[PDB]
Amino acid sequence: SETYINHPTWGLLYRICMVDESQDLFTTLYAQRLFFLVGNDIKAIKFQPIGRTEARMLLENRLRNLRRNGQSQEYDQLQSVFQRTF
Amino acid sequence: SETYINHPTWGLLYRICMVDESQDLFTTLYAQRLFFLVGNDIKAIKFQPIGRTEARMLLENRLRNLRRNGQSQEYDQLQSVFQRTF
Amino acid sequence: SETYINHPTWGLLYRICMVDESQDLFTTLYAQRLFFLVGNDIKAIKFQPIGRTEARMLLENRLRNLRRNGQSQEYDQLQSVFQRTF
Amino acid sequence: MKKVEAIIRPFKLDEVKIALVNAGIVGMTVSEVRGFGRQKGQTERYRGSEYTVEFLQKLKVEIVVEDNQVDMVVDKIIAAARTGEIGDGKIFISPVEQVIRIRTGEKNTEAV
Amino acid sequence: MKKVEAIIRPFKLDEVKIALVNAGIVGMTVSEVRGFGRQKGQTERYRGSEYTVEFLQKLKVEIVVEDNQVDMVVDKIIAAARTGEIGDGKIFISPVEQVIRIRTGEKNTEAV
Amino acid sequence: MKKVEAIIRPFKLDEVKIALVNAGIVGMTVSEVRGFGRQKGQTERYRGSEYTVEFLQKLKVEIVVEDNQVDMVVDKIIAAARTGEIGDGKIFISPVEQVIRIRTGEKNTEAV
Ligand SMILES: Nc1ncnc2c1ncn2[C@@H]1O[C@H](COP(=O)(O)OP(=O)(O)O)[C@@H](O)[C@H]1O
Ligand SMILES: Nc1ncnc2c1ncn2[C@@H]1O[C@H](COP(=O)(O)OP(=O)(O)O)[C@@H](O)[C@H]1O
Ligand SMILES: Nc1ncnc2c1ncn2[C@@H]1O[C@H](COP(=O)(O)OP(=O)(O)O)[C@@H](O)[C@H]1O
């Protein structure tokens, strides 16, 4: 499910993964390449910057959990996001 | 007076009523249908979610006050907003 | 270096000067004419309103410091921004 | 085929959309734009200071239709979007030489 | 000359850009738009309440190219932007009668 | 009638607007767009890390004018918008077959 939000400086961001119920990891579509952690459950939207190294590791961790769970569709989709992004 | 603001997630919002000097009630133009209360007098913009039931009741209350005050133009305009929205 | 950001109400803003490492002064492109001070180093973006009189004085101060420093390119560019804006 | 491009008051989006869908026009693209024209912004007050919005918020709704649908789509948009006050907006008609559906590679009438 | 206008899923921007640049198309303009069509939004949940996004986020990528580049640019965009699911978007071709480069006053083929 | 579409540096908006209004062109539509081309973004630093803005902020100003106003409008936009540096933008001219004023149903020359 494609999810986007707008950052006041960087413009349109794309959700590369859903971290949990309250939290999403986004990347910039117009800049190469910034990452932000954004809370779902917050009235003021805050963009927590996330480093590129850490972003990569977080996705790899999720990839590994998805294949262990046999969530193969979600794995395949995240894998393609990962390959495109990193 | 048409008033809009942009929500980072939901995009363009339209002011359905001016609650008071410091506060406006907005609805989503691109989603069917979310409501937000937004403060005028605040440096960080916060979007307070408002339920659909409550939104409806708040407008009905204002409608009733406008007709009691004989604010017939403002009533007519709000009435059309109400009919369109609910 | 052209720098812009988006204000949820007022829309696109243009950086008229870089106040310091953490802070920029912006003006509205679509409204005539609002000013905002915006922090670089903040996860929630806050727009601090700045009065027109004060905005003018702040730029004049910077103009004077640039010519004293012999920063003539930066002076010339800021001078043209100043003339356009005020 | 023709592109129909309507600059409307944003709150009119739902009415215009319903009118088009009811007329069997089932796809459209909407962009946010700022209009400058005869309609002026109300010289407002913020921190007790004067200013005017010079470029007012509008939406541009774009639909690509068959040549023989233009008058019908125009009539529907006009009735849905008008208010009678200056600032209601404009509709522009321009030629579209080809349409391709990305998913299939389908063209023209079969792509819309 | 022709304007090529592609409505795509936003995350496909990088792929489309790389494809165009690889095909020697070195300039393009991108706008954010909302699409309404056959693809529906997922009826989501916010504060435990139902709602649907009716106008879905897309990007419009516009490139002005020579007449004899249209098929090539179209093919490149299609291969880069498609997913096979409804909502992949559309490409519209329309005429451009003149191009002027602002910096120089250069025209047509020399302006792009 | 023709659509004139200028991609400009956003801070040039006021200059372009004044130039058009002075030339008796009293209506225009402005959209925010991102440009990719020969002009590159400055490889900046955020949390002490490198990155480049690839798609740079521009504005698209659209005006629909009479055929015999195109050269005049073009000249005015160019003089107002140019800086002499790469990234100044482009102007595209395309045909407009009909204009309708939504408030009245007025057409063509009488709708602009
Ligand atoms: N020459 C033009 N080209 C493109 N868009 C225009 C032009 N003139 C006006 N517009 C757009 O149409 C909108 C309506 O213009 P305005 O003159 O205020 O109202 P009305 O259409 O009722 O006379 C403007 O806000 C602007 O977006
Ligand atoms: N008649 C039209 N004119 C302009 N844009 C359209 C039209 N129909 C659809 N679109 C755009 O194309 C996108 C894709 O439409 P959709 O019907 O959902 O998918 P598909 O192209 O795969 O059938 C939409 O989100 C919308 O932006
Ligand atoms: N083929 C094209 N089609 C549409 N827009 C373009 C095209 N090429 C460039 N642009 C737009 O024009 C702007 C200026 O391009 P650029 O090559 O950087 O500067 P210059 O026009 O001075 O050479 C870009 O930022 C982009 O928005």
Indicate the DSSP class of residue D4.
E
Helical pair F70-81 and F13-22, crossing angle rounded to 10 deg: 150
Query: How far is E16 from F36, CA to CA, in rounded Å?
Result: 12
Q: What is the 3-state secondary structure (H, E, C) of C14-34?
A: EEEEEEECCEEEEEECCEECC
Cβ–Cβ below 8 Å for B45 and A44: yes
F62 touches ligand 1 (CB under 6 Å): yes
Which residues are D32's β-sheet partners?
D59
Query: How far is F5 from F35, CA to CA, in rounded Å?
Result: 14
Interface present between E and C (3 or more CB pairs within 8 Å): no
| Ligand nearest the Cα atom of residue D92 | 1
Closest CA to F93 of A15, E107, A45: E107
C-alpha distances in Å from residue C55, one per residue of B19, C24, C62: 32, 12, 11
C-alpha distances in Å from residue D12, one per residue of B59, C83, D58: 19, 39, 10
Contacts of F95 (CB under 8 A, 6+ apart): D94, D95, E95, E97, F1, F2, F3
Contacts of F109 (CB under 8 A, 6+ apart): F1, F66
Per the CB < 8 A criterion, the answer to whether F47 and A51 are in contact is yes
What is the least distance, in Å, from the CA of B30 to any CA of chain E? 5
One domain for residues C32 and C60:
no
Chain E residues near residue A30 by CB distance under 8 angstroms: 30
One domain for residues C30 and C3:
yes
One domain for residues C63 and C45:
no
Per the CB < 8 A criterion, the answer to whether D56 and D35 are in contact is yes
Resolution of the deposited coordinates, in angstroms? 1.9
Distance of CA E40 from the midpoint of ligand 2 (Å):
11
What is the least distance, in Å, from the CA of D51 to any CA of chain C? 5
One domain for residues C69 and C46:
no
Query: How far is E74 from C28, CA to CA, in rounded Å?
Result: 38
Contacts of C79 (CB under 8 A, 6+ apart): C63
Which residues are F73's β-sheet partners?
none
Closest CA to A42 of F17, B44, F8, D59: B44
Q: Which residues of E85-94 are buried (b: 16+ CB within 10 A; e: fewer)?
A: eebbbbbbbb
D39 touches ligand 1 (CB under 6 Å): yes
Closest CA to B27 of B40, B9, B12, B39: B12
Helical pair C72-85 and C52-69, crossing angle rounded to 10 deg: 160
Instruction: Tell me, rounded to whole angstroms, the distance of Cα B4 from its chain centroid.
Output: 10
Element (H, E) at A32: strand A31-32
Residue matched to tokens 């001078």 = C79
Tell me the technique behind this structure.
X-ray
Residue matched to tokens 């907006």 = D89
Neighbours of chain E (3+ CB pairs under 8 A): A, B, D, F
Per the CB < 8 A criterion, the answer to whether C20 and C43 are in contact is no
Range of the structural domain that residue E75 is part of: 1-112
Indicate the DSSP class of residue B10.
T
One domain for residues A83 and A45:
no
Per the CB < 8 A criterion, the answer to whether A4 and E10 are in contact is yes
**Nearest beta carbon to residue C32 from set D34, D47, D51:** D51
Helical pair A72-85 and A52-69, crossing angle rounded to 10 deg: 160
CATH of the domain at F37: 3.30.70.120
Hey, is the C-beta of E85 within 8 angstroms of any chain F C-beta? no
How much of chain A is helix, strand and coil, in % rounded to 5?
35, 35, 25
User: Does C33 sit behind a cis peptide bond, omega within 30 degrees of 0 on the bond before it?
Assistant: yes
Per the CB < 8 A criterion, the answer to whether A43 and A72 are in contact is no
Cβ–Cβ below 8 Å for A34 and F34: no
State which amino acid sits at residue A54: E
Chain B residues near residue C46 by CB distance under 8 angstroms: 43-44
CATH of the domain at A2: 2.30.30.660
Q: Which residues of D67-103 are buried (b: 16+ CB within 10 A; e: fewer)?
A: eebbeebbebbbebbbeeeebbbbbbbbebebbbbbb
The residue of chain D nearest to residue F65, with distances taken between CA atoms, is: D92
Element (H, E) at A26: strand A23-28
To test the ligand 1 pocket, which listed residue (F3, F16, F28) has its Cβ within 8 A of the most ligand atoms?
Answer: F28
Ligand 2 site, CB within 6 A: D 27-29, 62-64, 101, 103, 112; E 7, 35, 37-39, 56, 58, 86-90
Distance of CA E90 from the midpoint of ligand 3 (Å):
22
Q: Do the strands A31-32 and D50-53 form a parallel or antiparallel pair, or are they unpaired?
A: unpaired
Q: Which tokens go with C68?
A: 């004293």
Per the CB < 8 A criterion, the answer to whether C80 and C2 are in contact is no
CATH of the domain at B68: 6.10.250.870
Hey, is the C-beta of E19 within 8 angstroms of any chain D C-beta? no
Element (H, E) at C13: strand C11-20
The count of structural domains within chain D is: 1
Cβ–Cβ below 8 Å for D92 and F94: no
Distance of CA F111 from the midpoint of ligand 1 (Å):
9
Range of the structural domain that residue C21 is part of: 1-50
Cβ–Cβ below 8 Å for F32 and E31: yes
Indicate the DSSP class of residue F68.
G
Nearest residue (CA) to ligand 3, atom 24: F35
C-alpha distances in Å from residue F48, one per residue of A13, A32, A52, F44, F51: 21, 15, 12, 9, 10
Count the Cβ atoms, other than its own, within 10 Å of residue C1. Answer: 8
One domain for residues B1 and B28:
yes
Helical pair D70-81 and D13-22, crossing angle rounded to 10 deg: 150
Chain A residues near residue C26 by CB distance under 8 angstroms: none
The count of structural domains within chain A is: 2
Query: How far is E55 from D15, CA to CA, in rounded Å?
Result: 14
One domain for residues B26 and B38:
yes
What is the least distance, in Å, from the CA of C37 to any CA of chain A? 14
One domain for residues B21 and B60:
no
What is the least distance, in Å, from the CA of C35 to any CA of chain D? 11
Which residues are F16's β-sheet partners?
none
One domain for residues A60 and A83:
yes
Indicate the DSSP class of residue C73.
H
Q: What is the 3-state secondary structure (H, E, C) of chain E?
A: CEEEEEEECHHHHHHHHHHHHHCCCCCEEEEEEEEECCCCCCCEECCCCEEEECCEEEEEEEEEECHHHHHHHHHHHHHHHCCCCCCCCEEEEEECCEEEECCCCCEHHHHC
Query: How far is E34 from D101, CA to CA, in rounded Å?
Result: 17
Hey, is the C-beta of B29 within 8 angstroms of any chain D C-beta? yes
One domain for residues A39 and A56:
no
One domain for residues A15 and A28:
yes
Cβ–Cβ below 8 Å for B5 and C6: no
Q: What is the DSSP string of A37-48?
A: EEESS-SS--EE
The residue of chain B nearest to residue C38, with distances taken between CA atoms, is: B43
Q: How far apart are the first and last CA of chain E?
A: 10
State which amino acid sits at residue F71: D
One domain for residues C68 and C84:
yes
Chain B residues near residue D42 by CB distance under 8 angstroms: 1
